[PDB]
Each structure stands twice: as structure tokens, then as C-alpha cells.
Design a protein around this ligand. Structure first.
Ligand SMILES: O=C(O)[C@H]1O[C@@H](O)[C@H](O)[C@@H](O)[C@@H]1O
Ligand SMILES: [Cl-]
Ligand SMILES: [Cl-]
Length: 303
């Protein structure tokens, strides 16, 4: 069983190393019956297209951010509500409990089998013009977002205007002035080179998104129980590794961007940004009353 897998990041990124460890452990633990290979840098497609190829069984496994999953799996959109998690540690705690299984079940209905959860820190605004200290500083900024309408609503409510765009296109768009900014965690802001062209990083920390390590349902269904169990074990090992590497990477990436002269600032009052997101939550629970208890259960877990 040859398996092809997808990663958007470079091979040396925390997620990349963890997926290479996964591939190696799978081959060993299945005695060569399943032999995964990871293709990095999104060479097999942009994230929405890779999601579709994995759902249809054309790709066997992947590491997907739950952000672009929202338009495909309704429950996953809960994770894209701005500020729904107070910190990465709260996200890990919640996703590692019974609530995380609700999201795995929802993905399975759309042909994706979640084996473990990777972290992706906290996404913050960066731009080419000035520090963002209050929401009014976002006025006039054209900010790239991922492919989920909630992010357009998010930027618009903060005061700016948004444009959905593939991750691979962002560097050149910033360089040429087509966009003024984008938003991401420390390791992506650094790895991608965006920090070289957008020198202001303002810690809005507005999205804390899980990422899955998942397998195509069609590929999963070809396996014996023994090999399913082996691959589960390999994925749990890979997630523990990824999370440890992740924190080391946040530290290393911050040092690199500081050394390069990036201007990092805290926002005056994060609660001022959070208050402006209220209409997004209102509209969401009105549209999706069947998801309301998922939203309130996550909120209640962080009182
Ligand atoms: O902004 C993006 O598109 C990227 O953001 C990173 O944080 C996620 O790890 C990666 O999956 C996304 O493709
Ligand atoms: Cl981060
Ligand atoms: Cl993409």
C-alpha cells in the first residue's frame, strides 16, 4: 500500500518534520504494508483542492488547517469564530477531550478520518504600513485571508477590507502592493518570508486554529484493524512531536524576525477587537442553531 500525503509547508517546518516521522513509523509498524510519502510545499495543490482530492481518495493523507475546512464541514466553522479559544493551551485541552471527537465525527461524514490534532499557534495581523494598536488602525488596510467567508466578516468588522487568496500567492502580493497585509502565526509569518515584506506584526491573536492529521476514508477502509491501530499510534506520536517542535519553532521564529528588525507590538486592548466580533457570533448561531451548543460548550470550557 503506497500512500501519498500532503503538507503545505516546507519539509523543515514543525508540521513537515512531524509528518516525516509519521511516514517512517507507519512503514515500520505495518511491516512495509503501508509506505507513506509526504509531498511538501503544496506541490500537489492548494489547500481547498487538496481537501477535495483527499475526500475523493486521490490523496491518501494530509495535514489540513481547520480554517479552509469550514466551508466543507459545517461544524468546523465553529473553530473559525474569532477569539473562540483564549489560548493555544485551551485549544489543546478542549480538542484532546470529548469535544475534539465531535469535530472528528463531523469530518468523517465528509470522508476524512482524523487521527490526531496538530497546533498552529495564534494568528495575528501583519502589514506594510503601521502598527495596529486599536481596531481603527485596521481602517484602509487590504488584508489577505484564507478561503472562509468568516474571515472576510472578521476583517470587515475590524475596519479593513479582505481578499481570499491562496497561501502561496501572498508573498508576491505583499511585495507588489496588491495587498497591505495578511495574518498568521509566528512560524508561518517567518517561514513564508512574509516578514521580509511586511515589517509590522501586531498581536491581535484573533484565531487559534487546530490542524488535523487525517486519512482519506477510501484509503482507511482498505486497511486491516491491526494496521489501522498502528497508524493511529503513529499519528498520536506525530502530534505529540509536532506540538513540542511547534513551541520550539515559535521561539526560534520570533528570534529570527526580531533579529531582522521586525516591529512587534501588543494591541492596546484585545477586548476592543473581541467586542467587534459579536455580530459574527450572533449571525452564526442564528444560521446554525444545531451548532449553538458546540459554540457554548467551547465557551463554557473556558470560564
Ligand atoms: O494562511 C494560510 O493559508 C496557512 O496558514 C498556516 O498557519 C496554516 O498552517 C496553513 O495550513 C495555511 O495554508
Ligand atoms: Cl504563534
Ligand atoms: Cl492555499
Amino acid at each position: 500500500d503506497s500512500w501519498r500525503g500532503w503538507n503545505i509547508h516546507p519539509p523543515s517546518y514543525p508540521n513537515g518534520k512531524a509528518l516525516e516521522s509519521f511516514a517512517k513509523e507507519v512503514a515500520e509498524k505495518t511491516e512495509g504494508r503501508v509506505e507513506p510519502k509526504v509531498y511538501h510545499n503544496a506541490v500537489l495543490g492548494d489547500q481547498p483542492d487538496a481537501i477535495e482530492q483527499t475526500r475523493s481518495g486521490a490523496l491518501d493523507f494530509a495535514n489540513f488547517n481547520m480554517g479552509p475546512m469550514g466551508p466543507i464541514v459545517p461544524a468546523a466553522n465553529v473553530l473559525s469564530l474569532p477569539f473562540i479559544f483564549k489560548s493555544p493551551d485551551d485549544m489543546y485541552r478542549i480538542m484532546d477531550g470529548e469535544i475534539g471527537e465531535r469535530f472528528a465525527d463531523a469530518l468523517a461524514e465528509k470522508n476524512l478520518i482524523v487521527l490526531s490534532w496538530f497546533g498552529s499557534g495564534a494568528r495575528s495581523l501583519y502589514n506594510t504600513d503601521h502598527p495596529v494598536e486599536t481596531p481603527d488602525d485596521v481602517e484602509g488596510l487590504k488584508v489577505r485571508v484564507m478561503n472562509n467567508d468568516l474571515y472576510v466578516q472578521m476583517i470587515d468588522e475590524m475596519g479593513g477590507n479582505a481578499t481570499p487568496m491562496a497561501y502561496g500567492e501572498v508573498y508576491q502580493s505583499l511585495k507588489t502592493g496588491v495587498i497591505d497585509g495578511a495574518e498568521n502565526n509566528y512560524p508561518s509569518y517567518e517561514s513564508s518570508g512574509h516578514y521580509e515584506v511586511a515589517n509590522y506584526y501586531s498581536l491581535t491573536e484573533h484565531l487559534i486554529l487546530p490542524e488535523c492529521l487525517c486519512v482519506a476514508k477510501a484509503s482507511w477502509e482498505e486497511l486491516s484493524e491491526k494496521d489501522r491501530q498502528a497508524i493511529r499510534e503513529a499519528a498520536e506520536d506525530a502530534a505529540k512531536e509536532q506540538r513540542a517542535l511547534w513551541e520550539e519553532g515559535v521561539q526560534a521564529s520570533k528570534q529570527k524576525i526580531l533579529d531582522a528588525g521586525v516591529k512587534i507590538n501588543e494591541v492596546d486592548d484585545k477586548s476592543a477587537f473581541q467586542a467587534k466580533m459579536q455580530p459574527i457570533y450572533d449571525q452564526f448561531v442564528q444560521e446554525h442553531p444545531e451548532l449553538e451548543s458546540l459554540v457554548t460548550d467551547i465557551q463554557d470550557a473556558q470560564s
